[PDB]
Design a protein around this ligand. Sequence first.
Ligand SMILES: Nc1ncnc2c1ncn2[C@@H]1O[C@H](CSCC[C@H](N)C(=O)O)[C@@H](O)[C@H]1O
Length: 251
Amino acid sequence: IWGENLHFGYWEDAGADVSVDDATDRLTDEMIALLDVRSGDRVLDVGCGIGKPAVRLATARDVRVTGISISRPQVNQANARATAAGLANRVTFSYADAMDLPFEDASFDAVWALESLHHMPDRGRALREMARVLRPGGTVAIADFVLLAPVEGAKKEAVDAFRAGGGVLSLGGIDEYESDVRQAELVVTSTVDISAQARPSLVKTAEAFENARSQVEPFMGAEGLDRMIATFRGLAEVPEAGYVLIGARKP
Ligand SMILES: Nc1ncnc2c1ncn2[C@@H]1O[C@H](CSCC[C@H](N)C(=O)O)[C@@H](O)[C@H]1O
């Protein structure tokens, strides 16, 4: 239930009143730049959520996006959002699992995964499927949260809590993400630790929900809403809790 409810953002100032929606859009902008895409390419987006990132990509570059998810409501919302921005000709969404993708080999010019791989019960599988469907010359972009070091006591306690409510089936170090990418026979072009920029998202979104307590409360219940706010505030204070951007390429 804390899965499709937290979207990390890119924060730079320490001292500018930008919205949670502002920081999320900036992060997306780093991913757009990190894919390396030009007029006429095709892009696969794995774990599309409700479609915001894919619509932003389409507003920025002239490409075909297809988005993928294992939650039926989300596919319907994403498609409505696409049809609503008039991008139905090129932006489209369907229901499929990244552990077994139903696409032709070498279909896409590019692929991306924004905050989705930590759900997969096995990152390797997913990345292998992703390489299998990119054409040689094709590029990849990953954005996800990581554990920079092993933890204990109350630090481990605050991390576990987060994984429970967000369904984080596999959390790992950067070094682990890298060799997962290398196993799929992709070449790694950049890896950047953006912890310091991503961190503020946690307290800042705890605040947002608070402001909306009486309008979200009936959907989640009081105690559920409280545990989610508490769990973010705990995670914010464990500095072993990190975030990384990774670009990669197919020989
Ligand atoms: N095994 C899997 N295969 C394909 N999609 C999956 C998956 N496991 C989880 N997902 C989907 O991936 C998403 C992860 S949350 C990612 C949010 C999205 N990037 C956004 O900001 O809009 C969820 O929508 C979830 O339904």
